[PDB]
Design a protein around this ligand. Structure first.
Ligand code: SF4
Ligand code: SF4
Ligand code: SF4
Ligand code: SF4
Ligand code: SF4
Ligand code: SF4
Ligand code: SF4
Ligand code: SF4
Lengths: 183, 183
């Protein structure tokens, strides 16, 4: 078992241009007839990270991939699993219980209607107009796909994928060098 | 333990040609790519003795290498130490605490930026640009190298390296011969 890497923003180099959300929506919805052209998208837009603005600038936030994740523990059905290096949600066993929305201190999980093959997904017996199935969305760290598209789509290069082992060693070395040069 | 030598000028045979400082600068900075040729000097020039000119002529002044040296005593960090026969500053531990400039009454210590391997030496955390490291420069009587270079470069042969023991004996013998020939 190894530390889960995660993606973190940077308030000094973010402008709220929303160029990281659309790349996420394009890359994580390849099965809904998208061809890197605006106009072929016959579905509503669903990103995985979220951009929010305060008086101290604008920043996006997303799942930090906690090891002892509250969302994994609270989920009774077992949709949330640690399949790969990052914690991922399964869209087959989700039942729509809002417990995840209580579990996450950061609120990186959203509940949105599911869209497959360019058309709205419907359930069997509900209410008379039918109701669409609701699915939890969160960042998968693009394990099935290649490199993350939230990074490399930033004009100012703000979002960074960090391994929490290298920063610790680098900061330790910097602190040791700073203290050794004076004494 | 014996008296330390110190170079002294001679105002009768000094002109103000500044050809004794250049030799010192060229002999101390062998690690900054100097080849006894103007053009290979890629660093600003820093001598150790300073020429001063007033109404009654001109002369150079430098460190007299005091025994109970005020500069060594006031230095809290411990940069200035009597390592050899002469008194020498240490470039590793100096922090630029300017108390030396309040200690020496002659003023043979000057604070100037350091230059190592032909480039300016910067610090770790200061100001947004960096700032150069400042070191105290003073005469070290060429202890690491051979005989003094300010002498053997003076065209008029004004600078002399005096040992304060032989000079006293010479003056005593001169006075004794002058007085004993008359009684
Ligand atoms: S919303 Fe889905 S993943 Fe979250 S607890 Fe309910 S079933 Fe599990
Ligand atoms: S959804 Fe929230 S609680 Fe769950 S792993 Fe991500 S950041 Fe942690
Ligand atoms: S890693 Fe993939 S799913 Fe996660 S925020 Fe980036 S683009 Fe979206
Ligand atoms: S693409 Fe970069 S600069 Fe633009 S909103 Fe996203 S993180 Fe901020
Ligand atoms: S300037 Fe350097 S040599 Fe002078 S007292 Fe301070 S540390 Fe010592
Ligand atoms: S720097 Fe000044 S006080 Fe210190 S030894 Fe030289 S002459 Fe004396
Ligand atoms: S004795 Fe040596 S170090 Fe001192 S001023 Fe002369 S050349 Fe420079
Ligand atoms: S080289 Fe001799 S004459 Fe020329 S400035 Fe120096 S001490 Fe005076």
């Amino acid at each position: 078992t190894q530390l889960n890497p995660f993606v973190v923003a940077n308030p000094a180099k973010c402008i709220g241009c929303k160029a990281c959300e659309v790349a996420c929506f394009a890359v994580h919805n390849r099965n809904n007839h998208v061809g890197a052209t605006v106009g072929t998208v016959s579905i509503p837009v669903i990103p995985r990270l979220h951009l929010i603005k305060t008086e101290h600038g604008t920043m996006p936030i997303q799942c930090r991939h906690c090891e002892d994740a509250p969302c994994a523990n609270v989920c009774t059905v077992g949709a949330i699993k640690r399949e790969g290096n990052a914690i991922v949600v399964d869209e087959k066993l989700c039942i729509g219980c809002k417990s995840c929305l209580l579990a996450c201190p950061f609120g990186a999980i959203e509940l949105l209607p599911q869209y497959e093959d360019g058309r709205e997904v419907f359930q069997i017996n509900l209410k008379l107009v039918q109701e669409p199935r609701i699915i939890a969305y969160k960042c998968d760290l693009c394990n099935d796909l290649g490199e993350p598209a939230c990074v490399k789509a930033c004009p100012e290069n703000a979002l960074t994928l960090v391994m929490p082992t290298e920063m610790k060693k680098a900061r330790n070395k910097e602190a040791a060098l700073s203290f050794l040069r004076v004494v």
